[PDB]
Amino acid sequence: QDNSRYTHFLTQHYDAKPQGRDDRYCESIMRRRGLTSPCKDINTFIHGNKRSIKAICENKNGNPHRENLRISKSSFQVTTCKLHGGSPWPPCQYRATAGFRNVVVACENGLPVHLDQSIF
């Protein structure tokens, strides 16, 4: 069961099936996930199956990384939304960068609670 941080993690970084992996996608999703007041500078969404993400917390799909993080063994489709411009207030324009690679997360009680966005 989903503690607040894991739930928060999903709201901010998980979109099972994104309708688009483009700029408009970012503009829409950042808004729906309430990441636009103020505009979040950069935010990556992981797509695909939630269990694979959870699995990064076990050796099943992850390895230790750094001194408190885990990096996935598998690659995920991801979409990074980067704020375009300077205004921290809506409308938040975003440039989307679609990629496919493993991800780094922090796990707590076997659940991903933090996405290291420094690799995007």
UniProtKB/Swiss-Prot annotation:
Segments carrying motif Nucleolar localization signal: 31-35
Outcome of mutating T80S: In ALS9; uncertain significance
Annotated phenotype, changing C39W: In ALS9; reduced ribonucleolytic activity; low angiogenic activity; reduced mitogenic activity; reduced thermal stability
Result of altering T44A: Decreased ribonuclease activity
Phenotype for R95Q: Found in a patient with Parkinson disease; uncertain significance
Highest taxon in the source lineage: Eukaryota
Function: Secreted ribonuclease that can either promote or restrict cell proliferation of target cells, depending on the context. Endocytosed in target cells via its receptor PLXNB2 and translocates to the cytoplasm or nucleus. Under stress conditions, localizes to the cytoplasm and promotes the assembly of stress granules (SGs): specifically cleaves a subset of tRNAs within anticodon loops to produce tRNA-derived stress-induced fragments (tiRNAs), resulting in translation repression and inhibition of cell proliferation. tiRNas also prevent formation of apoptosome, thereby promoting cell survival.
Assembly behavior: Homodimer. Interacts with RNH1; inhibiting ANG ribonuclease activity. Interacts with PCNA.
Name the record gives this protein: Angiogenin
Location of this fragment in the whole protein: 25 to 144 of 147
